[PDB]
Symmetry: C2
Subunit: 301 residues, 2 copies
């Protein structure tokens, strides 16, 4: 029992983190097999990166894997990431994939500086394709990831901070999440919404942990819920969401639409100074999979 | 910018986690050099563990380090932990120490099942010597830890769940945190308090991140604060706490006693539907060191 914002063990990823220096820019890179991936705004000198990359040489890129120097024998650009071919394959390369996630899905972030990992935390891809991360100068190139049994699914590379303090970046093929670019504009985040299906999974987690004060006798239809959800800036709930919540409904005997009715009441009345799972807010950064994982017992390696 | 419940990178610790089986009991153990540490209630068959350990043989203890079997060549008891001497030193042994923490200090937990790490999360040692963790059957033997540069400071081994759903365990010399024992009684947690000095560090983190709505013109003395703190079940604030907050006071120009006055007002009025750092509650599981680390940029390895 208990419920915590939990991240994946980060060891498999620590073994891939390296430092990349060019000119007076230093950031983090990801070393898998014989390629080092990093953001392309590491190249020298409003931008046209194809111009700038042709005016460059392999020997301009310094790459540190701990103490050991790494010898760059080739480069190329893929969308907003840079691929630096080095002469040594990473012996610590885990089984991996490059995977792009959907708004509402969660991943773990390994924040890094100068190639040295600093910390690990859990977070979600907001519906407006930002993430509320924690980053300081030099964290460029840190990656986000999930782990399934023994395989590391990389889903995110960090690129920049937006004026509101939230963060933006790309998948590992170099394609940005959301309408952002790797050059200086007045870009801003769109207006965000709350991830409805996740709030309901979190409520099931509370029931499984002995909080039931918010439960009620009422029920409601999908349509009448969504009418109330949109009033409070909540995502619509789909029939697929109702199926994905099925297993959690079974374990507790609370029908999905019954729990919707409790959420409707919580939105219309607030919590009256009570708390759920140690929180005075409705939490939306836990998916149904996350809740089942933390209450059933699944491990990895 | 941004502020997140952050844990230490867990790789150095994953390399020490092993599985220990005896009789029909299976739990996790910690493998450093040529010793495997694990809770002693793994021994067979209200208890007297010295009786039970003398009726046992090295070959009763099965130890799995991944696939490889480990050969137990000796055993001994240290307080509530068991030391199992094996014939192989762990090549992945990091530089480490065994260190006992104080209520109010934080550490990272690597939750484990059958020797396989499952997840990593941050938490605090409550003033009543419990921790609000997340654990399921089989997590016995998982450890908590801090990392300072390259050295792993182990501070916790998990032992049991208490009737309220909170957790209890020992340091790595086998001495329990708090008035709990490794046998079945009606033991319960004492009444808890809120960690005052941590709430103030969290408020400084909010100021550093652009939340200032709770700041005020007032001030207050140490004595008049503590009179209000004790009313709301808050720890007393000491002059040492005021010194430890010094550097954060400097960075922001908010005098420690000025911020106390804001906390006094927050306690007497509530937040009026506003939030601080994404939270509708006053958070008390971040220390001054934690806040400086996450806003200055210190890494490890």
């Amino acid at each position: 029992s208990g419920f915590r914002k939990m991240a994946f063990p980060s060891g498999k990823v620590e073994g891939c983190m390296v430092q990349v220096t060019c000119g007076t820019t230093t950031l983090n890179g990801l070393w898998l097999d014989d390629v080092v991936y990093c953001p392309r705004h590491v190249i020298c000198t409003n931008p046209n990166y194809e111009d700038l990359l042709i005016r460059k040489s392999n020997h301009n890129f310094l790459v540190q894997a701990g103490n050991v120097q790494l010898r760059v024998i080739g480069h190329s650009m893929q969308n907003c990431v840079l691929k630096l071919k080095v002469d040594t394959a990473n012996p610590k390369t885990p089984k991996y994939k490059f995977v792009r996630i959907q708004p509402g899905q969660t991943f773990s972030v390994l924040a890094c500086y100068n190639g040295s990992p600093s910390g690990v935390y859990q977070c979600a891809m907001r519906p407006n394709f930002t993430i509320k991360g924690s980053f300081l100068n030099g964290s460029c190139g840190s990656v986000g990831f999930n782990i399934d049994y023994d395989c590391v699914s990389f889903c995110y590379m960090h690129h920049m901070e937006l004026p509101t303090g939230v963060h933006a970046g790309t998948d590992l093929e170099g394609n940005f999440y959301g309408p952002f670019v790797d050059r200086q504009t007045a870009q801003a985040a769109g207006t965000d919404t709350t991830i409805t299906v996740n709030v309901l999974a979190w409520l099931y987690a509370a029931v499984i942990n002995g909080d039931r004060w918010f439960l009620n006798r009422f029920t409601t239809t999908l349509n009448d819920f969504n009418l109330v959800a949109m009033k409070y800036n909540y995502e619509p709930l789909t029939q697929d969401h109702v199926d994905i919540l099925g297993p959690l409904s079974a374990q507790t005997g609370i029908a999905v639409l019954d729990m919707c009715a409790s959420l409707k009441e919580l939105l219309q009345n607030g919590m009256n100074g009570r708390t759920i799972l140690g929180s005075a807010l409705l939490e939306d950064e836990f998916t149904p999979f996350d809740v089942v994982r933390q209450c059933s017992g699944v491990t990895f390696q």
